[PDB]
Structure formats: structure tokens, C-alpha cells
């Protein structure tokens, strides 16, 4: 039904500005009581930062109150602006809808969340290497040397999801990230079924499709 799609995330510079947008579909933005932005630092909890009500009234968290929230009924979208960005602002930002009954500030409809990385470093695309297999066989892809987070890995364009393990990325000493995604398949299918891992790195516009073949 109602879908909240976020955009405007990614790599931003310290001291620069951030402009997020939450597009609402299958639902008129004038029907929600309020629209909110909620962020979550990596490994930390949730923090509400801003809201705007149907009557145009706005409110902000005093811990960040260099922040502006706005609403465009014509475009059916509301926005979040932040300047003087610091390292503490690196977080996954969500957009959420308020409530009409039993209080207004419990959120039942959330967006998918976009990651905002505050860093002066340069974006680097990843190198995708195959993990070739030797009952059940294992194979995977090695996504190496990219910045910043995140990287989305799928197998066979999303058709293969069972037995897939995409591990958390590790921060290498070089300052770059590196993760691996593996999958367990029947050994009798290595000759007939193909296996393509789809690596997508949005901050660098990198989309690599590597086929893992038995050596």
C-alpha cells in the first residue's frame, strides 16, 4: 500500500550540507498526521530529529536543532536539510509517518533508510573477485577495496536468495572496505546452473556482474 522511498544519501563532506527526500507513493502526504526523520548511528540506537504536522507546524530535537524539515504537498514529498555536518551525523536516516490515534508520535510506516557518510575521503569503486568452488558446494564473490559503505550484493539478479550469506564489511588498514558474499548450492548443479553475483556500489555508480565458474 503506502510506500516511503528515500533518496539523497551517500557520501557528504564535513561542514557541508545534506538534503534528503522521502517520496510517498500509494498515499497522499496530506493524509498523514505528521512526517518525521529518525536517524541511527552504526551500531547505536534510534534518535528522532525532526517532524512536521499537517498544519505546517515543525519541531526538532534540541540535540541537533542547523536542521530544517519541509513539506511539498504538490510533489507528495517531504525533505530534510542539515548543514554544518559533523562526524556524529554519520547515520542511517529514516523517514516515518506520525499517528492520528493513541498519541501522534508512534511511527507505524517507515522508509527503507539511506546511509549518510560524513567524510572528506574520495569515493572508490570495488574490485570483484570470484570464490570458485573446489553433496553441497560453496562459492562466492570477494568485494574488495571500496569506499564508502554500502555495497549491495545479489545472486542471479535476486533469483537466488536461499543459502546466501553476505558478511558484514571489514575496515581494512588501507582505509577501504572489503566484504564477501557466499552461497551454498548442490554439487550436482555446478555444471548446469550458472551463478552470477551482482555487486552494486551507488556512491561510485559501479555495477559489476561477475560469473563464478569452477576452476
Amino acid at each position: 500500500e503506502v510506500q516511503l522511498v528515500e533518496s539523497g544519501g551517500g557520501l557528504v563532506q564535513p561542514g557541508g550540507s545534506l538534503r534528503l527526500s522521502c517520496a510517498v507513493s500509494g498515499y497522499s502526504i496530506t493524509s498523514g498526521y505528521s512526517w518525521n526523520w529518525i536517524r541511527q548511528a552504526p551500531g547505536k540506537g534510534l534518535e528522532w530529529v525532526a517532524s512536521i504536522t499537517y498544519d505546517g507546524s515543525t519541531n526538532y530535537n534540541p540535540s541537533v536543532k542547523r536542521i530544517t524539515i519541509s513539506r511539498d504537498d504538490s510533489k507528495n514529498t517531504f525533505y530534510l536539510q542539515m548543514n554544518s555536518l559533523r562526524a556524529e551525523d554519520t547515520a542511517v536516516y529514516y523517514c516515518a509517518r506520525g499517528s492520528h490515534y493513541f498519541g501522534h508520535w508512534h511511527f507505524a510506516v517507515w522508509g527503507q533508510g539511506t546511509l549518510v557518510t560524513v567524510s572528506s575521503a574520495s569515493t572508490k569503486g570495488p574490485s570483484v573477485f570470484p570464490l570458485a568452488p573446489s553433496g553441497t558446494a560453496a562459492l562466492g564473490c570477494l568485494v574488495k577495496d571500496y569506499f564508502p559503505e554500502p555495497v549491495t550484493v545479489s545472486w542471479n539478479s535476486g533469483a537466488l536468495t536461499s543459502g546466501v550469506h553476505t558478511f558484514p564489511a571489514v575496515l581494512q588498514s588501507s582505509g577501504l572496505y572489503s566484504l564477501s558474499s557466499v552461497v551454498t548450492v548442490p554439487s550436482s548443479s555446478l555444471g548446469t546452473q550458472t551463478y552470477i553475483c551482482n555487486v552494486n556500489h551507488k556512491p561510485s555508480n559501479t555495477k559489476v556482474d561477475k560469473k563464478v565458474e569452477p576452476k
Binding site: 528522532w48 501522534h104 508520535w105 557466499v182
Partner: protein, 217 residues
């Protein structure tokens, strides 16, 4: 300002058992005959999902095994029968005062039987060797509990300082974990040795398991 204290920080319970989480507010959240406390469920990589609102009202579309109770400053979230998909971090949140703060979260883990890991070892790809660096990857697959040890051996010499590990979240399909270890060597050092082993120690193993391969075979 209202502050929330969730308890416990984490717990481990067998599947089908009852789980109880508590939330304590620094001041009352009761108003007009309602307790403005809410509960959320957040699974790995997903957005938080509302479970209970106004202390005890079940959100539409949420399984009936979730329920809330309490009033004033003390509240309770209960899972009557823990299911494998209920592995998540659970948050309480007061909706009575700006800035509508969330609790610090409670991690709920499913405690299943012991499962030994399936070990796989991967040689570095010939495409990566063109860059001068070799990455040897060892995979520990579908094991419980989470604790596991990986020891790299290059030509029977134990390695140190040149590997990095990574463990997945608990997999609701299996209630198990998986571990990926990457040994990083230079191309020259990789081409100068024969046997690359991955020794795995785990509770589900009576003896340590060692997977290895010979370079050039």
C-alpha cells in the same frame, strides 16, 4: 527530559519459550487514561517495525504472540512463544514528550542445539594475482553457538596479524551463524609456498577441523 532504560541488554532463549523485555522511564508517560509507551522490532538491515503502541495495543498485522503491559514508568514486552524469525533488537519508545526518545535496545537470540560448522577454503583468483596481492578466504558455515576459532597455516607455519574475520547475524532459517576469514598475502609470498590450511575450532567439534589446498592444483 524523559530517559528510557531497557532491560536486559541481551538474552538467549530456546525457540517456543516465553521472552520478557522491560522498559523503565525516568518519569511518567501516563496522560488522559493512556500510557504513551511503544515497542519496536528491528531486524538486521531493516527498518524498525511497530509492534505495540500505547503500552498494550497490538499494531494491525502484527502476530498475536507480541503483547505489552505496564503503566506509569514500568512497561513490559512479552513474546509468548519465541519463533526463529523473532531474532531482532527490540526498542521501547515514549510518545509523551519531545524528542520522543527510544530505549537503547534489547538483543533477542534464539538458543538452539550445537551445530558444527561446514568449512570451505578458497584460493585467490588469478585475476587478483595480477594486482600483486593474494586473498585466501576460509568459510565457516551454519554453526552454533557464535564462538569459533580460526587459525591460518601457510606451509604448516601459523599466521598472525594478516587476517580479518567477519560473522553474520543469526539466520532465522537456521538459527545459526557464519564466519568469513580472509588471509592477505603478497603475490610473491603466495607463489613461494605450497600448502595453505585453515584450522577451525568449535564446540561442535571433538577435534579441530583443517581444510587446505595445494597451490597449483
Amino acid at each position: 527530559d524523559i530517559q528510557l532504560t531497557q532491560s536486559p541488554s541481551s538474552l538467549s532463549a530456546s525457540v517456543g519459550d516465553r521472552v520478557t523485555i522491560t522498559c523503565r522511564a525516568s518519569q511518567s508517560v501516563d496522560y488522559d487514561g493512556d500510557s504513551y509507551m511503544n515497542w519496536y522490532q528491528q531486524k538486521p538491515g531493516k527498518a524498525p517495525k511497530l509492534l505495540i503502541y500505547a503500552a498494550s495495543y497490538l499494531e494491525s498485522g502484527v502476530p498475536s504472540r507480541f503483547s505489552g503491559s505496564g503503566s506509569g514508568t514500568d512497561f513490559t514486552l512479552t513474546i509468548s512463544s519465541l519463533q526463529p524469525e523473532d531474532f531482532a533488537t527490540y526498542y521501547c519508545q515514549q510518545s509523551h514528550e519531545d524528542p520522543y526518545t527510544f530505549g537503547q535496545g534489547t538483543k533477542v537470540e534464539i538458543k538452539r542445539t550445537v551445530a558444527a560448522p561446514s568449512v570451505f577454503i578458497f584460493p585467490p583468483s588469478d585475476e587478483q594475482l595480477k594486482s600483486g596481492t593474494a586473498s585466501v578466504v576460509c568459510l565457516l558455515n551454519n554453526f552454533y553457538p557464535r564462538e569459533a576459532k580460526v587459525q591460518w597455516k601457510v606451509d604448516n607455519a601459523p599466521q598472525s596479524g594478516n587476517s580479518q574475520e567477519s560473522v553474520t547475524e543469526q539466520d532465522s532459517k537456521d538459527s545459526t551463524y557464519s564466519l568469513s576469514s580472509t588471509l592477505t598475502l603478497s603475490k610473491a609470498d603466495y607463489e613461494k609456498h605450497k600448502v595453505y590450511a585453515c584450522e577451525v575450532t568449535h564446540q561442535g567439534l571433538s577435534s579441530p577441523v583443517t581444510k587446505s589446498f595445494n597451490r597449483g592444483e
